[PDB]
Design a protein around this ligand. Structure first.
Ligand SMILES: *CCC(=O)N1[C@@H]2CC[C@H]1C[C@@H](n1nc(-c3ccc(Oc4ccc5c(c4)ncn5C)c(C)c3)c3c(C)ncnc31)C2
Ligand SMILES: [Cl-]
Length: 308
């Protein structure tokens, strides 16, 4: 990890938003050098609370230097603290898995879908091992490094800021209701078992080629819907065996939901005989991986880890 000077970073375009901040595609030019390194920069939104502390690098570094040892979860390469807090990581070149499945639909294979499910479970299992509750797992937060390598991103900030998302009014009151466990919606309780609920929704997004969960149902009606027992429907390509795992992730009793270590072993087992568990149908050409680097100068590095 490095402390970056503001002259080292340049934002080149906005990529999108998530809790607490906006993500930009940027260029990192290490101080004193000429090489250009594509990065993603999350800029935290300013805290609008009048009673908030008006006031460092050490405090932020201590909180964000966590979970740096899995292939399946992102890690920061640097921070830059000035008037704003900038968190910097390698840019994942193929974007998010949500866009990938939406663009490829029926060109996908069962083996790829189950492999991604197993890698996401591996990343979450690692986050559970390092005692870091994610709070916002969704397919938009699963990034594509290469076709056979995905990484979970965007975690650690609620506990850095010691702030419930709903009380960070700079986020405009938006929360990912349709991915959240009931206890997170009603009581703002987040645990590794509520992450398991979000994992089930993420698997559902992948197996529907990126459908929107509960499409057409207003977020305000979701708690009543769940309390009455209604759940997301069976994706057409999923056997009942795979759908049963998703239903277990959505039980109101959080202790009865699967554990990530068991999800890793179940999806590794299914990924070894994929056509027995996922059947992509005629109703649903090679897949295209769309690059976030397609407009970058060829001399720029492709991955910050190449940098010495
Ligand atoms: C396809 C989906 C999509 O277009 N988007 C989703 C949501 C909005 C856009 C941006 C895209 N995206 N985000 C990041 C990313 C996310 C978080 C982040 O901040 C942290 C903070 C702490 C942290 C992190 C990451 N990893 C570990 N720890 C402790 C950053 C800096 C960046 C993307 C990246 C890195 N590459 C590509 N696309 C990204 C997701
Ligand atoms: Cl239950």
């Amino acid at each position: 990890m490095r402390i970056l000077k503001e002259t080292e970073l340049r934002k080149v375009k906005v990529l999108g938003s998530g809790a607490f901040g906006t993500v930009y595609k940027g260029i990192w030019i290490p101080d004193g050098e000429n090489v250009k390194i594509p990065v993603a920069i999350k800029v935290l939104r300013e805290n609008t609370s009048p009673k908030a502390n008006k006031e460092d690098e050490a405090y932020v570094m201590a909180y964000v230097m966590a979970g740096v040892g899995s292939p399946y979860v992102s890690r920061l390469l640097g921070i830059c603290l000035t008037s704003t807090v900038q968190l910097v990581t390698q840019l994942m070149p193929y974007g998010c898995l949500l866009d990938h499945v939406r663009e490829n639909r029926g060109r996908l294979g069962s083996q790829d879908l189950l492999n991604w499910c197993m890698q996401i479970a591996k990343g979450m299992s690692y986050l559970e091992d390092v005692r870091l509750v994610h709070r916002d797992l969704a397919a938009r937060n699963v990034l594509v490094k290469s076709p056979n390598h995905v990484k979970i991103t965007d975690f650690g900030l609620a506990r850095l800021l010691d702030i419930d998302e709903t009380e960070y009014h700079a986020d405009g009151g938006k929360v990912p209701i349709k991915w959240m466990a009931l206890e997170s919606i009603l009581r703002r309780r987040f645990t590794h078992q509520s992450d398991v609920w979000s994992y089930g929704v993420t698997v559902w997004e992948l197996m529907t080629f990126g459908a929107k969960p509960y499409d057409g149902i207003p977020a305000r009606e979701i708690p009543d819907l769940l309390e009455k027992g209604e759940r997301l429907p069976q994706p057409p390509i999923c056997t009942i065996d795979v759908y049963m795992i998703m239903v277990k992730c959505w039980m109101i009793d959080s202790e009865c939901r699967p554990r990530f270590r068991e999800l890793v072993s179940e999806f590794s087992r299914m990924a070894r005989d994929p056509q027995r568990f996922v059947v992509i149908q005629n109703e649903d050409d090679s897949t295209f991986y769309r690059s976030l680097l397609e407009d970058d100068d060829m001399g720029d590095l492709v991955d910050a880890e190449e940098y010495l």
